[PDB]
Amino acid sequence: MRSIITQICNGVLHGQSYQSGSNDLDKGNSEIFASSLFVHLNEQGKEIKDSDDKIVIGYTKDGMAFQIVVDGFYGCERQAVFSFIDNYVLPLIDNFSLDLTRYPDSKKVTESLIHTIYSLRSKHAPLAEFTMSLCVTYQKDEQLFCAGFGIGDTGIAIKRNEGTIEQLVCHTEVDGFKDAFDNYSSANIDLVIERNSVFNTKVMPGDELVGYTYVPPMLEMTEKEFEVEKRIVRHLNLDPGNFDDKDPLFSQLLQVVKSKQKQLVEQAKETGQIQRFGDDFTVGRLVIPDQLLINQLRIHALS
Ligand SMILES: [Cl-]
Ligand SMILES: [Cl-]
Ligand SMILES: [Cl-]
Ligand SMILES: [Cl-]
Ligand SMILES: [Cl-]
Ligand SMILES: [Cl-]
Ligand SMILES: [Cl-]
Ligand SMILES: [Cl-]
Ligand SMILES: [Cl-]
Ligand SMILES: [Cl-]
Ligand SMILES: [Cl-]
Ligand SMILES: [Cl-]
Ligand SMILES: [Cl-]
Ligand SMILES: [Mg+2]
Ligand SMILES: [Mg+2]
C-alpha cells in the first residue's frame, strides 16, 4: 500500500457513533462521522444490526486526494465488502488519477475503471455486494480537476470556495432495481453506467467534497427524472436550500440531519404506535489541497 489513508471507517457497531477527529497530516482537511439514523419504537414509544457503510479518505503517493463512499447490502457480507475495498479498489486509485491526466476523455477512463471494478469483484469477491461512489483529483494543464462516479444510492456534493453547493454524484433510484456492484447489475454494466453518475470538474484548493451514504429523504431534491426501456430513473441531489455559505458543508449537513432526526424521533415517540424508519448514516469530508500540502504529502509517501 503506497497511498496515505488519513481517515477510514469500517462500519460502526449498533448503538454507537464514530467521530474521527482531524488528522494533522492533511491539516484537518479530512474527517468522517458514522452513526445510524435507524429508529425502531414499540407502542410505549420505547426503543427496540451493525452498519455496513465504509468511507475511506486519503491521498495517492502523488499527493492526489480521494474519497470512497460504500454501502454494503447485507450484514453477513460486510467483511467481504470492507476487504474488497481495501484489497482491490484502493490500489486502483493512483493509476486512475494518472490515466485521467494522460488520456483526453475522462468519461472513457472512468467507464473503464467501473468495468475493472466489476471484473475484480466477479473474480475475487463474489460476496462483496455494495453501492459505491468515488472521486480523485488529478492535475492537467497547470490546473486541478476531480473526476469519479457513483453507482447506486451514495452521493457526493461539493461546496465551492464562493459558497455554491453542487452535486457531483447523485443518489440514483431505478424503479424495481438497486443498481450496485453485484452479480445482478454486472449483466449490463454499460446500461447501469448510463443511468447512474459519472463526473469531471475543475476544483480549487479549499473546495469541500462531502460524501454520504444516506440522508433523511426530505433533505434531497429531484434533479432529473427520466425513463429507460419501461423504468423510471430518479437523480436525487442534496437540497442546497437548507444550507448557507458560511460554515463547512460537512458541519451544516450534520447539524441539519441531527435537527431533522430529533423531530422524527419526537414525532415517533408521541404517536403511541410502533415506528420503524431511517438507515445507517456515514459522512466523509475532503477539502481539496493546495500545492504546498500536495508536495508535503508526496514527501510523506516516500519516506
Ligand atoms: Cl493502496
Ligand atoms: Cl487513520
Ligand atoms: Cl466508535
Ligand atoms: Cl442484512
Ligand atoms: Cl480484472
Ligand atoms: Cl482471476
Ligand atoms: Cl473465485
Ligand atoms: Cl467474497
Ligand atoms: Cl479535463
Ligand atoms: Cl459477478
Ligand atoms: Cl449493458
Ligand atoms: Cl425529495
Ligand atoms: Cl495552490
Ligand atoms: Mg442502504
Ligand atoms: Mg447498507
Quick check: helix, strand or coil at residue 204? coil
Domain interval for residue 268: 1-303
What 8-state DSSP symbol labels residue 183? T
Angle 17-19-25 from CA coordinates, rounded to 5°: 155
CA–CA gap between residue 44 and residue 28 (Å, rounded): 43
280 near 36, Cβ under 8 Å? Answer: yes
Say which experimental method was used.
Answer: X-ray
What is the Cβ-side half-sphere exposure of residue 91, based on CA atoms within 13 angstroms? 8
What 8-state DSSP symbol labels residue 218? G
- Between the alpha carbon of residue 243 and those of residues 58, 83, 150, 256, 300, the distances in Å are 26, 35, 23, 8, 36
212 near 285, Cβ under 8 Å? Answer: no
Ligand 2 center–CA 56 separation, angstroms: 9
Pairing of strands 18-19, 65-72: unpaired
CATH of the domain at 139: 3.60.40.20
Q: Is the dihedral of CA 80, 60, 123, 104 positive or negative?
A: positive
Ligand 4 center–CA 132 separation, angstroms: 17
Burial of 103 (0-12, 13-18, 19+ CB in 10 A): exposed
Ligand 15 center–CA 24 separation, angstroms: 30
* Number of structural domains in the chain: 1
List beta partners, residue 132: 70, 151
Quick check: helix, strand or coil at residue 152? coil
What 8-state DSSP symbol labels residue 186? G
Pairing of strands 220-228, 231-238: antiparallel
Ligand 2 center–CA 57 separation, angstroms: 9
> Shortest CA distance to 283 belongs to which of 57, 72, 130?
57
Ligand 12 center–CA 172 separation, angstroms: 12
What 8-state DSSP symbol labels residue 149? E
Q: Is 99 annotated as a binding residue?
A: no
Write the single-letter amino acid at 23.
N
Q: What is the resolution of this structure in A?
A: 1.6
- The number of the ligand nearest the C-alpha atom of 56 reads 2
CA–CA gap between residue 93 and residue 227 (Å, rounded): 33
Residue 16 cell numbers, joined: 454507537
